[PDB]
């Protein structure tokens with residue numbers, strides 16, 4: 611079960627939803643398309659409060675969280691629905707997202723290859739649990755992979771999760787599978803998106819960068835296949851412990867995940883198997 615918070619409780623613990631960033635002495639941690647994330651303090655314990663700015667995504671997040679409890683899934687502590695505002699309270703992840711850590715945001719040291727392998731395994735275990743419980747994430751990306759006090763990967767944002775076609779195409783363009791951009795809902799789309807995440811882990815480069823050539827990361831797969839370059843040329847230079855064999859092993863998994871034809875992609879159980887064999 612989850613704790614039922616009144617809107618006034620979350621108003622006070624976030625210092626009246628202090629929209630200034632943490633760095634300037636505020637409570638704002640960041641923002642997405644569905645809401646602003648604030649740092650909160652409840653009984654000497656730190657929390658993450660997402661104020662939604664939509665009701666179906668609130669209900670879906672609570673529904674999926676109540677059904678799915680796992681080491682590699684972020685934990686929901688509570689919620690608020692009494693006001694005209696909808697809030698979701700989560701366990702605070704001291705090491706933020708995988709995207710922020712790969713970009714060494716706010717002076718954090720680069721993640722070692724060893725830590726990156728454990729994160730990839732953890733994230734695959736998280737997706738596996740969701741698929742075993744007949745749930746499709748629909749928005750797998752490095753920004754949706756959180757890191758706890760031990761750098762354990764925790765898949766987040768189950769607002770777009772589904773228990774097939776759609777008229778409302780949702781997700782992050784740079785990570786989305788071709789059929790997902792076409793309106794299809796399949797667990798194979800989650801596999802493709804995980805393949806993009808694996809490329810981000812190897813390269814330390816975001817999936818999309820408008821001031822970069824090529825703009826999209828999944829295009830490096832084409833340069834490697836056409837023998838124009840190798841994965842060795844793209845290995846994150848911010849690592850000192852990356853070995854050619856295990857990097858090529860993770861790239862092989864990423865390449866299999868990134869097959870344009872959804873039926874040629876491996877299932878999450880096979881992805882999990884190949885990532886364990888890698889280490």
Ligand SMILES: CN1C(=O)C[C@H]2CN([C@H]3CC[C@H](Nc4ncnc5[nH]cc(C6CCOCC6)c45)CC3)CC[C@H]21
Nearest residue numbers: 631639640647658660684700701702703706707766767
């Ligand atoms: C502008 N920026 C900054 O000032 C710094 C930097 C951080 N930003 C993100 C903001 C949201 C955050 N999320 C969480 N951080 C800690 N503990 C958590 N527990 C549960 C969550 C989520 C919240 C959303 O719903 C799903 C569960 C969470 C991840 C980092 C990225 C951009 C950068």
